[model samples]
Target: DDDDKKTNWLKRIYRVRPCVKCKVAPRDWKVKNKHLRIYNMCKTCFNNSIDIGDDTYHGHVDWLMYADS
Candidate 1:
């Protein structure tokens, strides 16, 4: 039943961040480059690693199945 499914389908944890390019999720990692006290971005965008500025993003920027809706 739908009711039963809901009871078992516990919404999990997921990080929510806006994509600089796409309005879609599960796309790429939300990379943030700190600058001037906040952060700045390039027309290219971040990859994954927060310290290095571009590493292994794994394309999960909008990664979510059942959370933050």
Candidate 2:
């Protein structure tokens, strides 16, 4: 029941890790979670990492309806 310890513990829990990939990019905090991993990579790196195999990429009805948001 150490109040000082508790204070420091709560503070320690607050941190943002940098993107796991492209380890030297500037702060681009537009985050996206994929496969249980956090992607904080730059926009171009993230866009390139994804595959656009066909016309159906992000072509779902929901995507058409709400992806624009």
Candidate 3:
């Protein structure tokens, strides 16, 4: 049940940050299905050197909306 729970949580996280611009894909999102919440940034955003972490943490907010284009 724990694995299932993790999977479910990941699915939830996956759905959290849908793209605000195109509304097609998730923005800088993270999945905590492992030992730590793995921050998964969009490929384009990552390529642009966006910081993917919690908003409360420094650089996180910047990373999430760094490349709004």
Candidate 4:
């Protein structure tokens, strides 16, 4: 039941769209308990905060290294 709650945002926004980072179809998911909202970043970025949205997005170029660690 808890896992179901954790993955809801991806199912809501990106169900048919590509993820901001991976160009993959936003299939992956991560928990964002730190935020006030029921939040989630694309799991394709693997929790490195790279699924940033829209204009003026901040993406660290060496993002995957953080994904590993």
Clash counts for the predictions, in order: 4, 0, 0, 0
TM-score of each model, paired residue for residue = 0.19, 0.29, 0.39, 0.27
Sort the predicted structures by lDDT, highest score first: 3, 4, 2, 1
lDDT of each: 0.32, 0.35, 0.44, 0.40
Tell me the tens digit of each residue's lDDT in model 1 across 1-69: 654443344222222333433324422324244211111222245433455665443243222222332
* TM-score: model 2 vs. ground truth: 0.29
Candidate 3 per-residue C-alpha lDDT over 1-69 given as tens digits, one digit per residue, 9 for 90 to 100? 556665666566568765433445565544333333333444454444434433332222322211122
lDDT (Cα, 0-100) at 10 in candidate 4: 30
Q: Which ten residues in a row have the lowest lDDT in candidate 1?
A: 34-43
What lDDT does candidate 3 reach at residue 37? 34
Best by lDDT: 3
As for candidate 2, its clashing pairs are none
Candidate 1 clashes between residue pairs 3 or more apart in a chain or in different chains:
25-62, 26-62, 26-63, 28-61
Off by over 4 Å in 2: 1-18, 30-39, 52-69
Q: Please give the lDDT score at residue 66 for candidate 4.
A: 20
